[PDB]
Amino acid sequence: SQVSTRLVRLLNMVPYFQANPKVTRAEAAAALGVTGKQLDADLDQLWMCGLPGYSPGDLIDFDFVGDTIEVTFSAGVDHPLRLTSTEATGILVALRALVDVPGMVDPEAARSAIAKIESAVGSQRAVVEGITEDTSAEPGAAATVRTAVRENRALTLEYYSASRDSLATRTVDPIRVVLVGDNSYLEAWCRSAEAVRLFRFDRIVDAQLLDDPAAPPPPAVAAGPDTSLFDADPSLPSATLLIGAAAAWMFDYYPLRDITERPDGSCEATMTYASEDWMARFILGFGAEVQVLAPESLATRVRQAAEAALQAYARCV
Amino acid sequence: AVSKVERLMNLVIALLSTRTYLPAEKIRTTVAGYADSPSDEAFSRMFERDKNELRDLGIPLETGRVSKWDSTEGYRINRDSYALPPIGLTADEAAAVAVATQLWQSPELVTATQNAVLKLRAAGVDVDADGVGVAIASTATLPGVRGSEEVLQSLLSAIDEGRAVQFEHRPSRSADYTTRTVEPWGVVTHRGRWYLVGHDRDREDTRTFRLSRISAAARPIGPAGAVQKPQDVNLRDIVRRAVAEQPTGERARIWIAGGRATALRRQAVTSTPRTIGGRAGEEITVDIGTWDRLAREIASYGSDAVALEPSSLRDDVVERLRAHAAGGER
């Protein structure tokens, strides 16, 4: 319960103070994630408890120098408590989950951390394991992105826009790196369009470092971590489409809305599209599995595109 | 008047600082907090409850005999087993841990990760998250991490306890739920997707289940220690095999107009320029893999991509395009 965690924290406080000789109040509060009054009460409670006998030279006593904390007699408390199975398993799971995400953490650091934690806790091959012992799938652009984020230097990115299906070379300045679903996006301010955009790592062919350490406007204007300006907007058009039973692939990787069930397969769903061409390609991909319902203009455009493709195939050989 | 936390701290300090086993009566007499019990039975009950709590907190108590000339049982705490070995952490590892400590959202996992990070920091290293300046945006829309959070916790607990699991799994939304009882072996992640590896007790085969499909009812059953997975089995290799079976299918020649189909351009194996029907582009010889996926990719681009060989794929694309061009009646 709460008492158990409090006891663990109060027992592990002593080695933390022994490691850092003159840690202040604010640093300790930030490290242990507790309020000032709670920290003071815990420290005072730890002050009056120690080795049996309860002589003033037999219990743990501190040495308050102004607003600094130092240990003069630990009474045998020299090392922190071990790691239970649950917490170590959770840490290992998180570390092995973040090693495959591109750009959020250096894979070498993650592997070194995994090795050190396994050696410290004595874990074996009966724990969670990744797929790639050595990825080598990093093109080096992710490392350049991380370096630019750390050093606040201008970057040149060649991004593949799937909605317009093109390659655009832009000069952008990073702001922060965020994780959305299973696709981490680098957030950057672009002066070509002068806007905050989220670029996906797998869509970046290569990155170029440049010697233009210019502070982006958003830090001087507004630096909201989210900035979901068009992640979900009502202005985004939505097409109403009928989906067959066999075509269940799109039911998982895309945000279908207003799902209506029908044994006859006459009830449909609605999904938003950024561009008309993207939705047309998405519809044409599934073939007869997906039938167009609304809008009528989109259906006419899809029919015209299909007729043009049929004519092109007839002409070609 | 001694608080519970103070009593437990005194007890653990007294046990740690003694090199000889301590019987119950000595603990009652010496350690503070055990001198206010109105009766011996009440003291015994309180001491047993405290020892159960301390053992539950992971502290490795050892029970033995005081000496070869005495028989009363005594208690001790090993100083070697209680102390984790020292570890040296660089800046990169500290940054990695600081980034990874901000992923979970379940209160139990959050508490466990916080306690682990506190112990790691108290070990001597300095883990700081503000230096990197990387945050997490999505916390309630993830289908792998956030969506598969409670199920993963239940699976991890069952694996730790060495017990089989019974749950409800469906291959797809169209299909129906099926009750599956399997003995788990571990959890393996691939492309940021979890995949539970186990042996089914209803089909007797090694199966990998995507945690997104499974609902939250991951009920643990079976006695503890009844699960003995083979050590020579490599879970990651099985996961890799299950991810993809068809290596390359065949080699297909597809014509694509220049300047477009960049996603298909990246997938090109060999290319050769050619102009057909007044439109220039490149004919590429590529792999097949999943036939339906390649057919969808070809049909998406329409006139931009023209299939040449094999003829079966061209016929399939033509049939799908004619079905689309029928007007939606069928």
Residue numbers in the entry:
A (entry chain Y): 2 to 318
B (entry chain X): 2 to 331
Q: What does the primary publication say about this deposited structure?
A:
Here, we demonstrate that the binding of single-stranded DNA (ssDNA) to the WYL domains of PafBC activates the transcription factor.
In our structure, the WYL domains are positioned diametrically, forming the broadest part of the heterodimer. In our RNAP-bound structure of PafBC, the previously proposed ligand-binding grooves of the WYL domains are oriented toward the WCX domains. The Fo-Fc difference density map revealed extra density within this tunnel, linking the WYL domains of PafB and PafC. The arginine residues (PafB: R211/R214 and PafC: R201/R204), which are essential for ssDNA binding to PafBC, are oriented toward this additional density, substantiating its identity as the ssDNA ligand. Although the lower resolution of the ssDNA density precludes structural modeling, we show that, instead of two ssDNA molecules binding to the two PafBC WYL domains, a single ssDNA molecule extends across the heterodimer and contacts both WYL domains simultaneously.
